Amino acid sequence: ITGTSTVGVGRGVLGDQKNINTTYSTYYYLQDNTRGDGIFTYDAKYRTTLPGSLWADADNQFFASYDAPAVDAHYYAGVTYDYYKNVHNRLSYDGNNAAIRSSVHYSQGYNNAFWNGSEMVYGDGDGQTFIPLSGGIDVVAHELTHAVTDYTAGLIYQNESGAINEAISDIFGTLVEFYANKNPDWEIGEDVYTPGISGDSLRSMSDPAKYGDPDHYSKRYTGTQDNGGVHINSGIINKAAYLISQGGTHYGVSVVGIGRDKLGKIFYRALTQYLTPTSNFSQLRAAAVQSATDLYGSTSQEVASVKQAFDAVGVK
Ligand SMILES: [Ca+2]
Ligand SMILES: [Ca+2]
Ligand SMILES: [Ca+2]
Ligand SMILES: [Ca+2]
Ligand SMILES: [Zn+2]
Numbered sequence: 001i002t003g004t005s006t007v008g009v010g011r012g013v014l015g016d017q018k019n020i021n022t023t024y025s026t027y028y029y030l031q032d033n034t035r036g037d038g039i040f041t042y043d044a045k046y047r048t049t050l051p052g053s054l055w056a057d058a059d060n061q062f063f064a065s066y067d068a069p070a071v072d073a074h075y076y077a078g079v080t081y082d083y084y085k086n087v088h089n090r091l092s093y094d095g096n097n098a099a100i101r102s103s104v105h106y107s108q109g110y111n112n113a114f115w116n117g118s119e120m121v122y123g124d125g126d127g128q129t130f131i132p133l134s135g136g137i138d139v140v141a142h143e144l145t146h147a148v149t150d151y152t153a154g155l156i157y158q159n160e161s162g163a164i165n166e167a168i169s170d171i172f173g174t175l176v177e178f179y180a181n182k183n184p185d186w187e188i189g190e191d192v193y194t195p196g197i198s199g200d201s202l203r204s205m206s207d208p209a210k211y212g213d214p215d216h217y218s219k220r221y222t223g224t225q226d227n228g229g230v231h232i233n234s235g236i237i238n239k240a241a242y243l244i245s246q247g248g249t250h251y252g253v254s255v256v257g258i259g260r261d262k263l264g265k266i267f268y269r270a271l272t273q274y275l276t277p278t279s280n281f282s283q284l285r286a287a288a289v290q291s292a293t294d295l296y297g298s299t300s301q302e303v304a305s306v307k308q309a310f311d312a313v314g315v316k
Contacts, residue, residue, distance in 0.1 A: 001025050001054060005033045010062025010071035013135030014191065020075050022060060030055035030074050035081045036097030041074040044106040044121070051103045051119055069104040073122055073134035077102055080141040083172075083179040084148070088268045093147030100144070104134060113139055115146030129194060136192040141176030145169040153275030159228040160280040166230050167237030168271055174205060175264045186242055205242045208235030215239045216251065217281070217314030236281065236313050241267070243309040253312030258302045266292045266306060285310040 003025030011017050021032035021039070030041035031054065044052035055070050062071050077100045084090045091097045101119040110123020113133040120143045122133045133139050146169050149155055155165040170188050178184040190201035204210045213235030214220050220236065221229035243250060244266075247257030266288055273294075274287035288306050296302040310316060 001029055001031055003029065003031075006060065008057070008060035008062060010067055012072040012075070013068045013132045018071070018075060020062070020071060021078065022057075024060075027056035027058060028060040030057075030070055032074065032078055035078060035100075036092045037099045039074060039077050039081065039100040040102070041070050041077075042101065042103040043070065044103040046105050046108050048107050050106075050116075050121065051101055052106075055104075066105075069122060069124065069132040069134045072132075072137075073102045073104050073120070073140065076134065076137045076140035077120070077144065079137070079180050080144045080176050083141070083176045087175075087179065087264065090148070093144060094151045102134075104132070113143055115143050115150070117150065120144065120147075125192070128196065130189075131192050131195050133192050136189050137180060137182050138170075138173035138177045138187075139189055139192055140173075142169040142173030142188070145172040148172070149271065152272045153279065154277040155275060155279060156277050157227055157230065159230075160233065161278050162227055162230040163233035164237055164275070164279060164281065164284050166234040167241065168267070170203065170205065170234060170238055171241045171267055172264070175260060178260065186246075203231075203235070203238070205235075205238040206246075208239055213238075215313070236315065237284065240309045240313045240315065243312055244305055247305075250312040251314075253308060255308040255312055256301065256305050258305050262296075262302055266295065266302065269294065281315050285315050 001023055003023040006022055006024050007019050008022045008028055009019055021034050023029040023031040032039040041055045042051040043055050104122050106121050106123050109126040111125050111130045113122040124132045149165055149168055155161045186205040187201040188203040193202055194200055208215045213232055215235055217236055221232045243255040245257050245260045245263040247255050269291035270287040292303045292306045
């Protein structure tokens with residue numbers, strides 16, 4: 001929309017208050033003009049029809065409960081865009097400042113969120129297994145990173161190239177969460193998952209096994225559900241990613257940790273310079289070793305710890 005840039009206030013899914021960039025043209029729109037070509041938030045009004053309507057508010061105050069997911073979706077997109085830009089120097093997910101569009105209240109009691117190739121979609125959950133998904137910032141950056149993958153490596157969504165796709169999005173979703181200092185961990189969806197249980201989460205990076213995910217290549221899932229287990233084998237890469245940063249002994253294999261700033265940067269490079277659409281786990285390892293060597297040298301500690309971590313997970 002064409003209008004004046006302003007700032008409004010709303011309450012998020014967790015009852016947290018914040019300011020969000022909006023645009024004024026008779027109504028106050030969830031349109032942020034300060035980031036690239038902008039961030040747009042739409043109202044899917046419980047239908048499956050996308051994007052649906054650009055969000056319109058009459059007073060710039062988003063305190064109604066119906067408003068909560070649009071607030072968080074909008075805002076969390078805004079810090080994710082900022083992490084990318086400030087930390088890897090990328091403008092938007094395409095590297096050119098493309099507009100970020102998000103739709104909230106999609107379907108009725110939809111337990112999930114996704115990147116559809118051109119926009120992000122968030123359901124509201126059944127209110128028991130999940131609460132509105134835009135409420136978890138790691139969910140929101142996990143989603144945006146899928147945009148980012150699509151425009152860089154383009155990892156096909158199935159088998160090992162698809163589990164690497166899903167681990168990237170969980171690795172930067174977790175880096176974005178530490179980036180904002182929003183109570184970070186090495187867990188996925190913990191903030192939006194099972195409102196009645198405490199301490200649980202969708203997946204764990206620190207211990208994928210907690211919830212049953214392989215934490216070793218020899219545990220790899222070979223059937224068919226979930227596109228050859230995209231969201232299952234992703235744990236092998238999350239564990240590896242977890243060891244490089246923090247360090248540790250997995251299966252008798254010790255890893256000295258190099259920290260997360262360096263984990264983010266060896267990964268963003270592997271992802272943008274060496275990954276292809278068909279890359280497998282053995283290729284991800286070459287690629288990460290090659291980026292680590294690119295940045296820290298052949299004989300670095302960093303180079304050594306990525307080796308150790310893929311060795312500990314059984315990758316190659
Ligand atoms: Ca209002
Ligand atoms: Ca957290
Ligand atoms: Ca988390
Ligand atoms: Ca819970
Ligand atoms: Zn995903």
